[PDB]
Structure formats: structure tokens, C-alpha cells
Amino acid sequence: IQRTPKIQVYSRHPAENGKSNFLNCYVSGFHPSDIEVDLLKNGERIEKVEHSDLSFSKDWSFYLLYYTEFTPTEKDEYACRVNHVTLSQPKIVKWDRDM
Amino acid sequence: GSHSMRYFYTAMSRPGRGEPRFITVGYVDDTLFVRFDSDATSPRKEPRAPWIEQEGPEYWDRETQISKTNTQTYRENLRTALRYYNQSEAGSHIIQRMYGCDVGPDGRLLRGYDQDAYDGKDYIALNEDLSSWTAADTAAQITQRKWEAARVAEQDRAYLEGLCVESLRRYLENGKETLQRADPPKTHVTHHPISDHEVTLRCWALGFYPAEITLTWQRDGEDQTQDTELVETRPAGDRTFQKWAAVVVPSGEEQRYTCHVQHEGLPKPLTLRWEP
Amino acid sequence: EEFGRAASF
Incomplete structure (x- = not known):
């Protein structure tokens, strides 16, 4: 009936402090298709985040990639926040540069 | 093909x-x-x-x-x-x-x-x-x-x-x-201590196209299916894909573990180990 | 190229 999103938060390239990169949040495995995804920089919403065109896997579950350019530093914290009909509250997944 | x-x-x-x-x-x-x-x-x-x-x-x-x-x-x-x-x-x-x-x-x-x-x-x-x-x-x-x-x-x-x-x-x-x-994966193994006696070995594949790939861990040549954490293959946003496979292993046993990688961009399957 | 005929349910 309804399927809750899987969530991964990660970079396009290996992270290097002071080097420009892309921050990604990949949401997948969910149904139905409406989903809300924000990228966060130190708890706050990053503006003008882009996303991929709605696609789905062989099991009919949907996937999207949300992404923005970013320059990681040692002390700036990043996360992805996701809401879906299956979730009672938004789920926040912190960016871990080793995941 | x-x-x-x-x-x-x-x-x-x-x-x-x-x-x-x-x-x-x-x-x-x-x-x-x-x-x-x-x-x-x-x-x-x-x-x-x-x-x-x-x-x-x-x-x-x-x-x-x-x-x-x-x-x-x-x-x-x-x-x-x-x-x-x-x-x-x-x-x-x-x-x-x-x-x-x-x-x-x-x-x-x-x-x-x-x-x-x-x-x-x-x-x-x-x-x-x-x-x-x-x-x-x-x-x-x-x-x-x-x-x-x-x-x-x-x-x-x-x-x-x-x-x-x-x-x-x-x-x-x-x-x-x-x-x-076909772009083959760039591969490496990372080692993260959990605690005095356990460590995580993570086998990374990066920069590959197409998405299809197989990443497996063996202990003493034996597939570790049930004990491997495998993430879903994810898009990097530059056309390529990323994937990793991770196992928790006893400290001092790291060398009994090998990561095996198959991808159509590789001439032969790869075998990798933690390189201290 | 797409198929241009789509039959109704």
C-alpha cells in the first residue's frame, strides 16, 4: 500500500575541506510519489536545491536525487530532511563523510 | 554488449x-x-x-x-x-x-x-x-x-x-x-575502529557506469552475505554510480577478509583487502 | 522513440 523512503546523504566526490563539491540526498524505495526533501546547512534550509526527474525502479517504487553545490569545512554540519505520508514526523539524516 | x-x-x-x-x-x-x-x-x-x-x-x-x-x-x-x-x-x-x-x-x-x-x-x-x-x-x-x-x-x-x-x-x-x-569502479577499503575489539571494514566502489555491480565480502574465502551491510547503489550526479559494502570484524582478524568486485568495466573481478 | 498508440484501461 505505502512504502517509506530510504535515505542516503553523501558527496559527489570524496570530501576535502575547502574544496568545492556536490551534496546529494538520494531518496528511494518510496510510494506514493509525493515527498518533501530539504538540504540543511547547520540546521537551516539551503536555497535553490535542484532535483532529478521522477523515476521508478522495477518494483514500481520511486527515486529522486536532490543536490546542491557546497564547499565542506571541518565545522559546518550538513543534513537532509525528508517528509513522506509514511512518516509521522520529518526524518533528519546527517551527512557523514565516511558513508 | x-x-x-x-x-x-x-x-x-x-x-x-x-x-x-x-x-x-x-x-x-x-x-x-x-x-x-x-x-x-x-x-x-x-x-x-x-x-x-x-x-x-x-x-x-x-x-x-x-x-x-x-x-x-x-x-x-x-x-x-x-x-x-x-x-x-x-x-x-x-x-x-x-x-x-x-x-x-x-x-x-x-x-x-x-x-x-x-x-x-x-x-x-x-x-x-x-x-x-x-x-x-x-x-x-x-x-x-x-x-x-x-x-x-x-x-x-x-x-x-x-x-x-x-x-x-x-x-x-x-x-x-x-x-x-563502461567506466570501471575506483575501489578502496577503509578501516574504522568501533571499540577496542571490533572494527568496520568498508569496501567502496566509486565513479562506475553502468550501475550494475557486485560487491561482496569473504571471511576465509567464504561469502559473508548475512553479516554484510550493503547500501543501495546511488547516483553521483555526474552520470556515475557509487556503492559500498561493510563488515564488522574482530580486531586482529582484518586480513582474513577480502572484498570482491565485479563490474563490466573490469577485465577480471577484483579482490581487495584492508591495506594498513 | 515512443510507441504512439496507448489503449485505454
Whole structure:
């Protein structure tokens, strides 16, 4: 009936402090298709985040990639926040540069 | 080697918020090349890969007309599905379709596909014979009878053996620099202490295309399926994909573990170990 | 290229 999103938060390239990169949040495995995804920089919403065109896997579950350019530093914290009909509250997944 | 073309429709009703949204995306292998969204300022088929840009204005008009007609058909289909499942007009529902063809290295048809779903559950599918259908339930059986009466399978078959393979062959030639280039994974093993006596070994694959890959851990040459944490393959956003596999191992036993990597970009499968 | 015929449910 309804399927809750899987969530991964990660970079396009290996992270290097002071080097420009892309921050990604990949949401997948969910149904139905409406989903809300924000990228966060130190708890706050990053503006003008882009996303991929709605696609789905062989099991009919949907996937999207949300992404923005970013320059990681040692002390700036990043996360992805996701809401879906299956979730009672938004789920926040912190960016871990080793995941 | 072998290749695929697939189109994916999502038609989503939204009572109270206008007519149902209709979205089409087209792929060759793991490469998005075309999109359509009924919610777009001026809805048209739009190119999403450089190699489809050389298709003429006739192509774009024809492809755009197909999508506009389908917007209407799939809206009709959503209304019909309500009747077939005795459902109210208050709720939001989704029909999905995926269809296309696979070809071999010689470019001949390997197999064709045309399947639909309703609210994420199989609804009806063209069988591999391209002559007959499988319906999931008694509602889809109604559709099957209509499609049998109207010889829809024969129409599918003529498309999948003709235009589907012909167009895919042309896209593969026009896009040969990318559609016919496998990028192998860049691979490494990281080591993270959990605690005095356990460590995580993580086997990374990065920068690979196409998406298909196999990453496995062995302990003393034995696959560790049940004890491996495997993430879903994820897009990097530069066309490539990423994946990792991780095991928790006793400290001092790291060398009993090997990560094995298979990908079509590799001449042979790779074996990797933690390199202290 | 898409197939231009879509049969109704």
C-alpha cells in the first residue's frame, strides 16, 4: 500500500575541506510519489536545491536525487530532511563523510 | 554488449488540486535522455542527453504530441480504475507504466516489455511472447478482455520489433562515446575502529557506469552475505554510480577478509583487502 | 522513440 523512503546523504566526490563539491540526498524505495526533501546547512534550509526527474525502479517504487553545490569545512554540519505520508514526523539524516 | 531502452510513465490524480499530473522519462541503459511533465510551463518533450539533441524538429513535435495524447489517456485510465475498484473520487491514486526493448550486441531484439501498475501494485503485463497478457486481479482482467478484443498485443509487438529496436540502435550510434563506454569502479577499503575489539571494514566502489555491480565480502574465502551491510547503489550526479559494502570484524582478524568486485568495466573481478 | 498508440484501461 505505502512504502517509506530510504535515505542516503553523501558527496559527489570524496570530501576535502575547502574544496568545492556536490551534496546529494538520494531518496528511494518510496510510494506514493509525493515527498518533501530539504538540504540543511547547520540546521537551516539551503536555497535553490535542484532535483532529478521522477523515476521508478522495477518494483514500481520511486527515486529522486536532490543536490546542491557546497564547499565542506571541518565545522559546518550538513543534513537532509525528508517528509513522506509514511512518516509521522520529518526524518533528519546527517551527512557523514565516511558513508 | 547488450542494451535497453525504457520509457516510464507516472500519472498521479490529486483531487482538489487540478487534473492528474503526467510525467514521462526515457532511458537508454542508465542514462536519462528525454523527459515530459504536464505541469511544465510549456509542456514538451525535452532532451536530457547531448546525443538526442540532433534529432530534428519533426522528432520533437511528434514525441511531444505522443505525450500530450497520453496525458489525456492516462487521465481517462485513472477514472476507469476508480470504477473497477469501486473507489471514491476523493483520494489520490497513481498509474505507472514501464515499456521498451532489450537488444543484443548485434542489435537484434532480446525481449520486449510493456507493464502497468495501479497504486504501486502490478496491474497488467505484456507476456514475453508479445502475444498475450497477464492480469493481476479481476479488475485488470476487464482491461485484458478489452485489449484482446482490440488486438493491442499485435500493436505492441510491431512497435517492439520495429521502431523500438530501430531507434535504440540509432541512439547507441549517436551516443557511442558514452552509451558504449563502461567506466570501471575506483575501489578502496577503509578501516574504522568501533571499540577496542571490533572494527568496520568498508569496501567502496566509486565513479562506475553502468550501475550494475557486485560487491561482496569473504571471511576465509567464504561469502559473508548475512553479516554484510550493503547500501543501495546511488547516483553521483555526474552520470556515475557509487556503492559500498561493510563488515564488522574482530580486531586482529582484518586480513582474513577480502572484498570482491565485479563490474563490466573490469577485465577480471577484483579482490581487495584492508591495506594498513 | 515512443510507441504512439496507448489503449485505454
